Amino acid sequence: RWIARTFFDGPEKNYERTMAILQIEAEKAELRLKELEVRRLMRARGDGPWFHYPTIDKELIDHSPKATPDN
Amino acid sequence: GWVRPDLGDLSKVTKVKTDRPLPENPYHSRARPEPNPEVEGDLKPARHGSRLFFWTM
């Protein structure tokens, strides 16, 4: 009789801790099933800036009437 | 009765007159084409933190 309430508890702490730390899982094992959804299969679209590769900067073009009309 | 154009000639870029239609929509100018959309969003921190293997925080 004087062992439990001196030391520990029953189905009020070790239950609903199982219900507690098993809600840190469905936002962990499911976001890890979105990286494979997105990173490996992005793929040919390249919409989200992960496969964004630099090509050229069009700022350095010129527009003056350069001295040959047919160029 | 003509002029001796000493130095004023062959310089001083002018304008002439509007004679013909200006060729807008030039030689081909096919497309841009379209860009890809961006994200503005809202910078929140990590949802539970770094989610790597066990790695709580």
Side-chain angles (χ1 to χ4, degrees), chain A residues 23 27-28 31-32 35 45-49, chain B residues 36-39 47-48 51-56:
Chain A
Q23 286 299 110
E27 282 83 4
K28 184 173 284 188
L31 272 74
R32 289 177 180 174
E35 291 290 325
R45 288 188 293 271
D47 196 0
Chain B
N36 296 319
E38 67 175 1
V39 49
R47 186 177 178 88
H48 289 282
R51 288 183 284 110
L52 181 60
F53 288 98
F54 50 99
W55 301 107
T56 63

Side-chain angles (χ1 to χ4, degrees), chain A residues 1-5 7-8 10-11 13-15 17-23 25-56 58 60-61 63-67 69-71:
Chain A
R1 180 168 177 83
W2 181 67
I3 193 167
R5 62 175 177 86
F7 283 162
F8 62 95
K13 288 176 70 173
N14 286 320
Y15 189 79
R17 182 180 294 167
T18 63
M19 284 297 181
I21 70 168
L22 272 69
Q23 286 299 110
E25 175 63 20
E27 282 83 4
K28 184 173 284 188
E30 292 295 324
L31 272 74
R32 289 177 180 174
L33 290 174
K34 299 296 184 183
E35 291 290 325
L36 190 148
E37 188 70 28
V38 174
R39 180 180 295 276
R40 181 180 180 269
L41 189 61
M42 194 70 206
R43 187 62 181 85
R45 288 188 293 271
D47 196 0
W50 286 354
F51 289 161
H52 186 273
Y53 292 159
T55 303
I56 196 65
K58 71 181 182 181
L60 53 89
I61 201 64
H63 296 287
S64 296
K66 294 182 184 293
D70 291 329
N71 50 3

